[PDB]
Amino acid sequence: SYDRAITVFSPDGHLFQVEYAQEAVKKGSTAVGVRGKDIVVLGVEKKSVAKLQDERTVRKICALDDNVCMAFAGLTADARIVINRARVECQSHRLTVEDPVTVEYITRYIASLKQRYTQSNGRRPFGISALIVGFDFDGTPRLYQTDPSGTYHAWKANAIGRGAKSVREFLEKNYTDEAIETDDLTIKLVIKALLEVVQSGGKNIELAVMRRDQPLKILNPEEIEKYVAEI
């Protein structure tokens, strides 16, 4: 069995492997999450959109449970593994506590799994960052973000992947209480925030929202097109 230490400390207390994993997240397609009043919206860029590719197979916005979904950035293959782990954990929690897991609880689990991979023998860190949204039993909307190191915070509006900083700068100066007043407005914010980086605005963005109680919904090309015309 391979027991070599891959993630180790450097002279100035830096974990090179973890920073290299963060570099992989920077080359990932932009993903934006906005926490609205009664809704949660996720928006990922489609980067190179070919005309011969089945759109439904490369979605970067998956569902972990009825109330929890997530968007990622970085290594797609790595993301799949993490998503499956989370899904299994969600069913385990639902079976031992007889209740839907809270957004923060599953966020905590994924973050913990990522940290475990930065201090274990024979493995490298996961090369992805995730945006976790959803609603808890009481009805309050949640938005979390985990990274390769294993750290996680709760946000109002965040952006990961290539151009995360650019989108973050625009989100700060555009996120207010009069920007998430209505469901439509909240979605427009994410679309407008995604238009700051994603080239050829229109069908280059993958959007999906999660309204209170109902299952995850995915906006269609023409449904997103209409929103773009209003902006």
């Binding site: 391979y2 492997q17 290299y20 570099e23 089945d54 197979t57 499956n84 024979g122 493995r123």
Partner: protein, 242 residues
Amino acid sequence: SRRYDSRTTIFSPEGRLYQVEYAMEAIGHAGTCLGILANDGVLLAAERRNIHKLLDEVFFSEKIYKLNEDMACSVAGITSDANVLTNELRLIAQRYLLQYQEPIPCEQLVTALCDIKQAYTQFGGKRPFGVSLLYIGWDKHYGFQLYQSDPSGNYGGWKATCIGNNSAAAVSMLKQDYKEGEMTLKSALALAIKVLNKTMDVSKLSAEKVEIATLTRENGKTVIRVLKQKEVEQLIKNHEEE
């Protein structure tokens, strides 16, 4: 021993995995495979590289493997690696059938092999599988389907794709000619020959240098079948006329 370790599953300073990238270089040099999905079926068409006159023919095909009753795949890159993966897909499909008493849906099969491929990239210290696959299948959820996976353990559904030598060229040629929803197996097969005539630098295509499986439905039964040389010859003939 740290001294001799090659360090296969660690990131580079730009967040790249070199072994995976170099496994991919292998593939771009393998024989060309192309997949086209039609309304009435799906097909694979592969350049043969086993060409020497003293090769015996004894086998179904060089690079096209049947995975279960409803799917096949063709492979590009390290042949002996492909043998490991193709045997594993057969095992995965039979595991599913044993458990659910139903054929494995095509995307579930692809995903489960790709999990095996991603694990080699992340832990264990071994080199990755130097293989890309194209998979063709029919299932009751999505019907006719075509997938591609690569040594990173990444996969994606396609209408038409190509891997191996001169894939980039094949793709731009498929982007010009592939008609979404308007494609028939006859049309698909024609396009295959067109794309294969251009990705192969032997001018005359030759029905000895290619391998073509088609996958169709007849009476609620999937039918996978390697085209015989006559049919391919005719197919080639038909391209010459154009």
